[PDB]
């Protein structure tokens, strides 16, 4: 089920320094987030919703932090970086609500 109930978002990434951008799909699961390529539409990475420490949504890009400075933050271009934060900020309330 590398794509069942998971909402994918077309976000663009900034390669090394290419003035260009690289499209990418981001799957948001109810308990995890995944990096899905827009080129192969395949899952490139998987993350736990309990790993995200914080985020910052702006009318241009979305940023998330796994709390692992070493890993570094992960930000990409998103015209709806807000919804991605509302959809995410929304799953975090549904997983913690059933944990009570």
């Amino acid at each position: 089920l590398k794509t069942y109930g998971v909402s994918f978002f077309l976000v663009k990434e900034k390669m090394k320094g290419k003035n260009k951008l690289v499209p990418r799909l981001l799957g948001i699961t109810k308990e995890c987030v995944m990096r899905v390529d827009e080129k192969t539409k395949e899952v490139i990475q998987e993350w736990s919703l309990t790993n995200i420490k914080r985020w910052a949504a702006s009318p241009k890009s979305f940023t998330l932090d796994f709390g692992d400075y070493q890993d570094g933050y992960y930000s990409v271009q998103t015209t709806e970086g807000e919804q991605i934060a509302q959809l995410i900020a929304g799953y975090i309330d549904i997983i913690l609500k059933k944990k009570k």
Partner: peptide, 8 residues
């Protein structure tokens, strides 16, 4: 400002 999550 930033924003956090209840996940303590």
């Amino acid at each position: 400002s930033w924003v956090y999550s209840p996940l303590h």
